[PDB]
């Protein structure tokens, strides 16, 4: 037949038209012509180059564009819309033959090529679907709410004859109903027959639940949902919580026995998938020499310190601390008998309305391994380890808190002052020993909790009391406070000039939202490379200065009658110097980095003190 001949159907329906041998041969030949005769604007072989990159990675799936097939040959597009199931087998055999025609012996490295249609005009919401859409090609949006594991499905099945012990050859599984045999060719029997698990070849299977995105739902109504089945290379692509675009076929579950089941005869529906798309920190040798180049510009430190929370006004000290705790340091083991941690903890104590949660939000978008938990609220993760039951699989699971789940990363605790006793015990253990212990339901174990803590809290009453020390404004205890390196105090001092700029910035935000800076994308990757390969050094020519600095700050602290100074302050000094040095991708901690570090600790100590002590110290420590 010819192409304009096919567009006069001479059968009861499309399905019976497509299955006739003469029309199948025609469409197979015309698909070969489409594969090997396309040309872009310039004329490049759009599918030729795709079929040669098929060879290199050796993939088993091919991408086709509906726009091109509508451009060339329209009856094929109509049949693809109406009866895709029959079309896709024919189209997949054509692709496999064409690939072999350009890569010989690829039928061994892979035995079947899958076609996935990329673009398609009509896009539906889950609530619009009706019974006129059954057995048709559809494209939908939604959000992924649940996910199952990977189960194997039968592809090439071998049977045993339990009288003459023979293995009957490959039989194909259609993904509709289970296949059963009835005749043994060697002994001529219809006896018992069982599937040979060892000689069978299987396929990947997974199921997902799609929900209407909350934003689009018209007022007053509720979101609808549907189920999606993914086969082979599509398993484990979209993790729960993301928005996806699905191209597939709309089908009925042939439930079971329609007998019994008294009541109206209703049926259930599913979607069988063809393509999924979404609607990183790995780097390359192109960007490595750009890293090194930016590292040679004097003053990379102040660029980084102004590339942090790029939408909160002022608060330079907290941004410096954020950078320090977002780069890190070097963990240490002295001959397997002494450990000094590497991460630097940061506490925020501030009055209501100073944008602490905004910085905590930024840290989570900027970091690799960051987790969020709340003290007094509703969060998807707690702080205590436990053994609970899985609602879906009905299994017992071991779950750790955010502290365990955020190993070698950062943990973000919001509303740090409203914890119950259990959460406080967990936090203390994690910060002190850096490992979580559990003895529940026969499980005795210790887990690793090498994590960085950033926390936010509100004083007692609601406002800061400058006439008393830090320990008497907040409900936390000295054991916990002493385990933090840097303490930041945000004070709502009524100053006339500052309000001008604060209100200006805030009003500009609303006005603009009506219906130095390094780019964030490069900073994200620079942070990972630096923390992966940069372990700066401490050559001891520079020991004389710090000995005498510590001596002076110890002699002054006891004289003034305030907090004691212990060696944890010097350890913090060195650990922060490591971070300032690592900022410059450096090779030997400089004295400039040490001097920059000294300010942070001295300022923290001076600013966390009573008014009288603070006036004494702010004059005594003027040189550092």
């Amino acid at each position: 037949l010819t192409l304009e001949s096919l567009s006069n159907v001479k059968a009861n329906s499309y399905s019976e038209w497509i299955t006739q041998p003469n029309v199948s041969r025609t469409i197979a030949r015309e698909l070969k012509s489409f594969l090997l005769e396309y040309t872009d604007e310039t004329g490049r072989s759009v599918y030729g180059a795709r079929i040669r990159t098929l060879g290199e990675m050796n993939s088993e799936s091919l991408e086709v564009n509906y726009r091109h097939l509508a451009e060339s040959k329209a009856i094929l597009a109509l049949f693809l819309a109406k009866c895709p199931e029959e079309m896709l087998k024919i189209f997949d055999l054509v692709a496999m033959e064409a690939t072999e025609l350009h890569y010989p012996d690829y039928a061994r490295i892979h035995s079947e090529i899958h076609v996935r249609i990329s673009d398609f005009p009509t896009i539906y919401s889950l609530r619009e679907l009706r019974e006129s859409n059954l057995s048709s090609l559809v494209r939908v949006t939604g959000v992924v709410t649940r996910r199952t594991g990977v189960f194997p499905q039968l592809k090439y099945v071998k049977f045993n004859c339990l009288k003459c012990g023979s293995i009957l050859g490959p039989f194909f599984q259609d993904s509709n109903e289970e296949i059963r045999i009835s005749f043994c060719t060697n002994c001529k029997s219809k006896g018992p027959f069982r599937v040979n698990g060892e000689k069978t070849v299987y396929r990947n299977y997974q199921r997902v639940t799609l929900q209407e995105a909350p934003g689009t739902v018209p007022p007053g109504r509720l979101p609808r949902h549907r189920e999606v089945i993914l086969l082979a290379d599509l398993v484990d692509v979209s993790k729960p919580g993301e928005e996806v675009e699905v191209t597939g076929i709309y089908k009925n579950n042939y439930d079971g026995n329609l007998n019994a089941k008294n009541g109206f005869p209703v049926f259930a529906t599913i979607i069988e998938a063809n393509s999924i798309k979404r609607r990183v920190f790995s780097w390359t040798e192109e960007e490595e020499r750009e890293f090194r180049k930016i590292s040679r510009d004097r003053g990379i430190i102040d660029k980084i310190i102004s590339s942090m929370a790029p939408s909160i006004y002022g608060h330079r000290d907290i941004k410096t601390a954020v950078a320090c705790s977002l780069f890190g340091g070097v963990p240490k083991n002295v001959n397997g008998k002494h450990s000094i941690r590497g991460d630097i903890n940061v506490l925020l104590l501030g009055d209501p309305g100073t944008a602490k949660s905004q910085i905590l939000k930024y840290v989570e978008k900027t970091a690799h391994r960051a987790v969020f938990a709340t003290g007094q609220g509703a969060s998807a993760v707690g702080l205590t380890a436990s053994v609970r039951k899985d609602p879906i699989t009905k299994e017992w699971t071991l779950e750790g808190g955010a502290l365990v789940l955020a190993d070698k990363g950062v943990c973000l605790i919001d509303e740090f002052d409203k914890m119950n006793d259990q959460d406080r015990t967990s936090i203390h253990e994690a910060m002190e020993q850096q490992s979580i212990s559990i003895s529940k339901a026969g499980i005795v174990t210790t887990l690793q909790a090498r994590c960085s803590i950033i926390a936010a809290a509100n004083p007692n009453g609601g406002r800061y009391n400058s006439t008393l020390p830090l320990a008497q404004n907040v409900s936390l205890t000295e054991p916990i406070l002493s385990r933090f390196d840097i303490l930041c105090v945000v004070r709502d001092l009524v100053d006339e000039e500052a309000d001008e700029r604060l209100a200006t910035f805030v009003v500009d935000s609303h006005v603009r939202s009506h219906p130095s800076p390094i780019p964030q994308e490069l900073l994200m990757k620079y942070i990972h490379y630096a923390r992966t390969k940069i372990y700066p050094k401490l050559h001891q020519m520079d020991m004389d200065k710090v000995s005498r600095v510590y001596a002076d700050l110890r002699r002054e602290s006891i004289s003034t009658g305030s907090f004691p100074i212990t060696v944890r302050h010097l350890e913090s000094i060195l650990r922060i110097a490591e971070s300032f040095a690592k900022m410059r991708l450096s090779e030997f901690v400089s004295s400039y980095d040490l001097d920059r570090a000294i300010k942070v600790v001295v300022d923290s100590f001076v600013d966390a003190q009573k008014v009288s002590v603070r006036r004494q110290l702010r004059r005594s420590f003027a040189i550092y």
């Binding site: 194997p152 499905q153 698990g197 993760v381 071991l398 779950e399 750790g400 789940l405 005795v444 887990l447």
Partner: protein, 82 residues
């Protein structure tokens, strides 16, 4: 005739992925393992282990779905809690 027959021991275990390198906000996945004879009572829950085995299936919604499991062939423990 039971007094004239001989028997052996069989056990079931569940292995879980390290609770640390898990996707954020998803339940950890586990697998079911079977062992017998001279491999029983060699471990206790809470231990981190290395297992060598065969990946197989058994029959227990969907047109044709099977459940995976591992046949144990070796056990090695990182270090035990004394």
């Amino acid at each position: 005739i039971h007094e004239s027959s001989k028997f052996i021991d069989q056990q079931f275990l569940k292995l879980q992925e390290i609770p640390e390198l898990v996707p954020v906000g998803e339940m950890p996945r586990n697998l079911t393992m079977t062992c017998d004879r001279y491999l029983t009572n060699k471990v206790i829950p809470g231990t981190r282990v290395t297992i060598v085995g065969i990946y197989s299936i058994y029959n227990s919604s969907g047109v044709a779905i099977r459940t995976p499991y591992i046949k144990i062939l070796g056990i090695q423990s990182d270090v035990e809690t004394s």
